[PDB]
Subunit: 354 residues, 4 copies
């Protein structure tokens, strides 16, 4: 007994991760590979397989099919890593046609009735679907995952905000190329260079972190999220996968790095308690060596490769300020892997039927 | 009429910048190219010319000579970019033999009688040379320049600390390979990877910044330096030259990013006043665009290429925090250029004879 | 008596070399920077200065103007490095307005009345302008330079072909990114990868070499060009400038590599003879070290930087086969520099204004 | 029924492949991880895992042990990828103590009594062992595998030489960084550069190819190997795994690239006929796309990832010349996978008993 998934944009840098991971999944099958430009061609002939291994045997000869909900009677779930602008209306059209829709796209991320989900952090937000359906009058639904960059920060910051009076986080990112898609970043922009991404990208990263944090169930009540200073300075360099982030985190009062570090080691959420198939044992992995994590060596760490955010370099700066770094696999936990985990949580909660 | 310079480690990545720059200098000539390994060989035959243009024609034919005082009777100034551990005692040997020694090495940077010198920040600390001479019973002297990474931070921070109640700066660095020398960083460390340098390197960057800031003559007296919180998280990636740094800067009172930027634009010190030949018209260049500076494009910027720290992205974070970035050409301003500027100051103040 | 020149696609990777070089030129001035997208704006504000130094002081505040042959009264020369498909009809408009056009684009390279010019190899071919003017009934004219990759092989092969019974050349190229222009090659195509350009690219390289070789005045007449076997296998990697090529060259009879070496060393042409300003003293520089030439260190070689093809590794393979490598600066000698050289030749022979 | 393996230099770039591969092998166990500088420590804590996936769970905890025959009583096979100069005497010490040693080092590659083994091309030359043992008066033996670079040309070239009148091959290599080990190639040698490896490396590549070809059993007799002309021009670039080569192959008589293509597509040797576990189904994979193979996308191709040489771009140059490209995974087929395959062969022919 399995569920049949369609993956929109299946030849893309995110769609390849849905293909790789769903090919190994116990009950979600990659059964319908949707596109536009290469409709009618075999997947393995057209795809850039910029990930680990090779195109799965059983997928390689599948023809890419039209992005058309009228052709998808047989499909149980839509995964939608589509580009911004194009995504919004396609996802509405699928939802209106009665599909569950898991989007990795930005278009719906701040709809107050659409869940911006990190399953370990705000699983309770899925019950927004009730109101979504009723107010939007459709049988289906849309759920979004956040910007991968925002997730590499929000996961550690969420674990901390939960239990500590955190009052700011000032972040520097060093992001990989695959985040921008293909053709994406011109090679001349990152050879012997660093490409700042600009105020617009900095501002959207912070916006998304604020939404995720505004939804975390905390054990302390100070400070109020509105009194939290977040800031980001974002860049891309010539790494293929893996977003590397340096966070300076401030607290309203005296807070020991050793305590925070232990909170990070100990972090887990509903996905781990439920033993969901794509839930890592340790959604945050903490490293103790002063030159770790490194992008190359740590982006595929953990019992489920790519699904863990890897943290290190925990250090006291002064009594109210600590330094840490974090690494997220941007197309796995940051996108496809997070979206598959969303789907398992939604099946588990009753929102997608068996 | 000419002053004759020896360049120790002349073939090295800093040594080459001495040669390129002094080749164009109105009164300090590269008269003696010293080494060890390639003593006896033509310079241009052996040097790795990893900088702009080609080996100066009047220099290529010059043979590499021993690093030995008794051989250097005609020499007026020693520039010493020698590796740590080796440098300390060689520098002392030269100073003892009557030479002015301008070192880019770490060994003497914390000696209480030795200038750790950024001409635009603490030009007055050259007066330490007078007590150094009495203390150590020698007619020469040692002056050091700071770690290039420290200069990238300390230059814009020194400008701010001078005029503002700055109580913290929290730094992320993305440093180039030339800084590590040759063979330096293994290729496998930086292809598809980011290399963290570790706690010792972070700590040493901070300690050097503290020494530099403690010597700035400030126009406000608050807060005390002992009350200032610094932190650095340092990395290398595959860029050839140019250290890029993101600085989150806190103040003890409300502070306008607009004012701080004006302060950086208008920044100048003694070298510009005295019109030293290597003094750039703008020791700090401020950029307005939200994707500048960039390493490749801005590392050779300004009227003296590579002598200016290029700053950008000035933004208000909250009322007491600002974000900026800076780029420093690590072997020009960050080492050889700073050294040559040091030498021009020392000549102008009578420390090195005409 | 300064000639004023218009630069089409002035913001581009090749246009920047016209802007750099003509800024230092003794009688050809860059007086009209033509674009489309950025027309009106200052050159310095928009241009991506992906070359040595900085935008020239006196060019930076020049406005980008529209590309239209009715707005250029002040103008004496057109330099056109425009993309294929676009460039063919544009350049015709300019010659059909009176202007002399030196083109770096592919469109007219195979017109039997359009010179396809390497000034050291086939300078006499400029007389095709006479019967080109006649048969097209227009007052101006078009001259084109060859694909950079083809120049990197044909300059040494032409010097060889003129004096030796060469029957074959079998080429592997390893080309830089700048040749694809901007946005050009996506970053994901060349990070930890080699990108083959394909059969169409291999075939167009060979076709151009063949045209050029057919136009070389020889001292031998064996074999005939029609029996010469040429092959290329072309790639790009993550280098910014410099196309590196490995050539296995065969001969119809016993031929010594030391003789061919001397021929390449001694190679001069009409540009040298006339002492044209942009003519290098050594159009082919021959290196003797078995690890040279190297892209990084040799692409800017020579008295006129980037104007010389640098050759090395001359080795006997068997009695009738030799191996050599060559490095060409693809935007300088391979485009803008060759073009400026074409402009100087044509003035000399009285085809251009004054 | 298992054979216990000792992996010398286990933490090296070739060691980690022995560990990775053997960890999944049906009958060879990686039982003893030998080293020097990290003896006493757990493998997982010190190893640089610069390959696919992560350190196998059951290997991670294993302690690195001394390289000492006296400690290895229970070991059945020694795999030795030790650096040149060290390897020779150590491998002789192991064979004189009674062990079968399969070496990836160059030291013994040209001993008359030491097989230089590509299992698909010259499996019979294992019989050399008998006179090795007689002559050397030792109960163990040494077998070597060739230079990875030589295997990338020798595998397709042997398959051609076996069936066609091949009289020359003229090769250009574009090799990865991992072949030079760690720290190996300094990062500054390869950023925005190509590093030629020189005459000694070119000559040794060809010498190894000649030896291997002289031991291939042919179906045709012309020409004699002594009259075949080989040349190599070798380079390194900033790729991690995978050596890419372009080969121009010539023949003494007319030979159609379509036929040579069919021969390569159909290539198989004794390891396939013996169904050895590590024998890929297709020791040569032939691709049809004019932009394939590519390093990143194909170095891990095949039913056994990295065990197949991938060939592409088969094209007629003239009646007597073709062009093809080949890609080898240099640490799998080119080193550890090739060694394991030799060991299986030696087990199958009774030289190593289970």
């Amino acid at each position: 007994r399995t569920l049949k998934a369609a993956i929109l944009g299946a030849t893309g840098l995110v769609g390849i991760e849905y293909v790789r991971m769903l090919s190994n999944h116990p009950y979600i099958k990659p059964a319908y590979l949707a596109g536009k430009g290469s409709v009618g061609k075999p997947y393995g002939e057209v795809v850039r397989w910029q990930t680990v291994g090779q195109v799965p045997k059983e997928i390689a000869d599948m023809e890419i099919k039209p992005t058309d909900p009228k052709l998808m009677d047989d499909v149980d779930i839509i995964f939608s890593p589509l580009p911004q602008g194009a995504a919004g209306p396609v996802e509405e059209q699928f939802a209106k046609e009665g599909f569950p829709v898991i989007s990795n796209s930005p278009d719906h991320r701040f709809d107050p009735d659409v869940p911006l989900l990190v399953p370990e952090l705000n699983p309770h937000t899925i019950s927004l679907i009730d109101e979504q359906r009723k107010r939007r009058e459709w049988k289906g639904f849309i759920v979004t995952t956040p910007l991968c960059t925002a997730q590499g920060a929000a996961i550690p910051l969420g674990a901390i905000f939960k239990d500590y009076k955190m009052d700011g986080a000032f972040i520097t990112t060093i992001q990989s190329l695959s985040g921008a898609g293909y053709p994406g970043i011109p090679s001349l922009d990152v050879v012997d260079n660093i490409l700042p991404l600009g105020d617009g990208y900095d501002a959207k990263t912070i916006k998304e972190i604020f939404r995720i944090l505004s939804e975390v169930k905390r054990n302390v009540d100070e400070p109020k999220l509105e009194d939290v200073s977040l800031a980001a300075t974002t860049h891309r360099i010539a790494t293929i996968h893996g977003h590397y982030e340096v966070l300076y985190v401030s607290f309203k009062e005296e807070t020991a790095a050793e305590k925070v570090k232990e909170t990070l080691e100990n972090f887990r959420g509903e996905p781990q308690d439920l033993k969901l198939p794509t839930a890592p044992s340790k959604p945050i992995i903490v490293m103790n060596e002063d030159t770790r994590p490194q992008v190359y060596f740590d982006r595929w760490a953990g019992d489920i490769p790519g699904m863990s955010v890897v943290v290190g370099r925990l250090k006291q700066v002064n009594k109210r300020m600590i330094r840490l770094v974090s690494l997220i696999h941007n197309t796995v936990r940051g996108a496809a892997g997070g979206g598959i985990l969303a789907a398992e949580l939604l099946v588990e909660k009753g929102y997608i039927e068996k």
